[PDB]
Write a protein that binds this ligand. Structure first.
Ligand SMILES: CCCCCC/C=C\CCCCCCCCCC(=O)O
Length: 149
């Protein structure tokens, strides 16, 4: 049962979401330290995000995939507020935690294993048929729009 201590992911966040457009992603990637070549390939790559109830059938456990033009990530059987270690899109190991700030806000925090000082949180919000991913680095903000499929 899902009403005994673990958080439930609102249905709002379940499904397939395809990257359609973004705002200020280039200056954000620049603040993060990416040179021109890397920024072009990062910002113009196709992204499909998938969030589902865990295929294993464990209640309040989830699966999420980041499917891109090149690298894909597959995070299986995670729980909200529970940290796990896995390979991220940069092909390195990260400590990841998905959590709920409130029923309308999903967070995703990454800590680099080889750089524990590198800590970053991504925020997801639903806005109509869109999942909006928000990020901020050194005062530079960006929003990426994923159309629910
Ligand atoms: C997240 C940073 C990735 C750095 C390494 C990228 C390597 C090869 C090019 C792949 C470009 C497509 C992925 C762009 C990142 C999408 C981020 C997201 O939607 O979570």
């Amino acid at each position: 049962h899902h009403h005994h201590g673990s958080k439930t992911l609102p249905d709002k966040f379940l499904g397939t979401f395809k990257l359609e457009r973004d705002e200020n992603f280039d200056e954000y990637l620049k603040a993060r330290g990416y040179g021109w070549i890397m920024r072009q390939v990062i910002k113009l790559a196709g992204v499909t995000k998938k969030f589902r109830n865990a295929a294993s059938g464990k209640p309040d456990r989830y699966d999420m995939e980041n499917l891109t033009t090149k690298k894909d990530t597959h995070h299986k059987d995670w729980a909200l507020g529970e940290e796990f270690q896995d390979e991220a899109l940069d092909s390195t190991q990260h400590k990841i935690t998905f959590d709920l700030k409130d029923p309308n806000t999903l967070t995703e925090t990454h800590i680099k294993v080889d750089d524990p000082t590198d800590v970053e949180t991504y925020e997801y919000r639903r806005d109509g048929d869109y999942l909006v991913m928000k990020m901020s680095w050194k005062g530079v903000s960006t929003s990426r729009y994923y159309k629910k499929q």
